């Protein structure tokens, strides 16, 4: 931790003495006798367990619609909207995702 001297006001660093170590400083004569036990306990931040990302569980969060996809004739599919600048004028595009045994991703 941070410990200062009461006389001068500077900091102290532990050094070796004659028989045992002592708290001394290089600014003014001041020695403190080391006693039975002084101890500082710290609690470093531990790490947690990581989660598995991806899967249909997270895909159920986003809501889907009813539009057929011409790959396997399956009506269930996810639709999203996006803004894109075309060559002539602004144009809103839709991203299509097939929620089936094939699972394709299209952009029309």
């Amino acid at each position: 931790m941070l410990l200062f001297c009461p006389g001068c006001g500077n900091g102290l660093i532990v050094e070796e003495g004659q028989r045992c170590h002592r708290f001394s400083c290089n600014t003014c004569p001041y020695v403190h006798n080391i006693t039975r036990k002084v101890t500082n306990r710290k609690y470093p931040k531990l790490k947690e367990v990581d989660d598995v990302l991806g899967g249909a569980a997270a895909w159920e969060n986003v809501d889907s619609t009813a539009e057929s996809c011409p790959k396997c004739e399956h009506p269930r599919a996810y639709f999203m909207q996006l803004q894109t600048r075309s060559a002539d004028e602004p144009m809103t595009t839709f991203y299509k995702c097939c929620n089936a045994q094939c699972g394709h991703r299209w952009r029309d």
Binding site: N40, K42, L46, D51, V52, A56, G103
Partner: protein, 298 residues
Amino acid sequence: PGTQMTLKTFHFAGVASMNITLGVPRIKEIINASKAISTPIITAQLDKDDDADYARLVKGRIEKTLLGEISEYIEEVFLPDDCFILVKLSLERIRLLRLEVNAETVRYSICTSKLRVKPGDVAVHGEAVVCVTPRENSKSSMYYVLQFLKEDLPKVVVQGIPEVSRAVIHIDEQSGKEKYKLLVEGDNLRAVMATHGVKGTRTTSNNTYEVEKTLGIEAARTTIINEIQYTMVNHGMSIDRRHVMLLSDLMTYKGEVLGITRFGLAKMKESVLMLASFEKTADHLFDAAYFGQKDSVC
């Protein structure tokens, strides 16, 4: 295509919170063929794709785990005798993470650390408690190196690869089958692909320079075409296969993967007149008269 390629994050959703650049930056980095790549993502497949417990076991294998995050608590004890630092290894957090690091493993990782330490005053007391006594020599007192070893104990890696930073497992579903794919975010593929968990046969990378260093120059012309086509289908556009096949073979015929920069163009072409517009005031112009090379007008 690049003209209409100036939009923001396209497939942005809470499902996958993964920062991967896709658009004109990715195409620009591919054309420049720089060594340092941004947002590295590298995918691998497992041998056991049915059990997820094996996937969780091998996930902790390829991952840089530190000592301070696993250590329960560290404390400096002071007594009439010589002081030392004491760290309490928690076995429950190791059992929850399914790690194969024991007290001797921590001792071997500490003795093989970068800061000044040799196996003279580093011991294990019981099961998962380690005591380290700092020496008094060769730089200053032991008090100053005590504050220096306490802030690098967490920095000392106990297991994994220092290159890889973060890893997550992805779940693929089908008609009836389930698959688990391990994607990590690092650069040194030679170390992750040569692992017991992930199958080294089925593994794809994103760094063209690293994949031509590990696999080869002929295998780098295929991964540079797949990344370009993966960026063009994300925009709703369509290019021909040989259009990019000819561009991938243009920086693969002479030597290694050469980038389209000011330095690589001087390695590709050998005409000073065309470089006169790229470079600056008089450097090349005077070095040409100094050396005296013949420019071919072709």
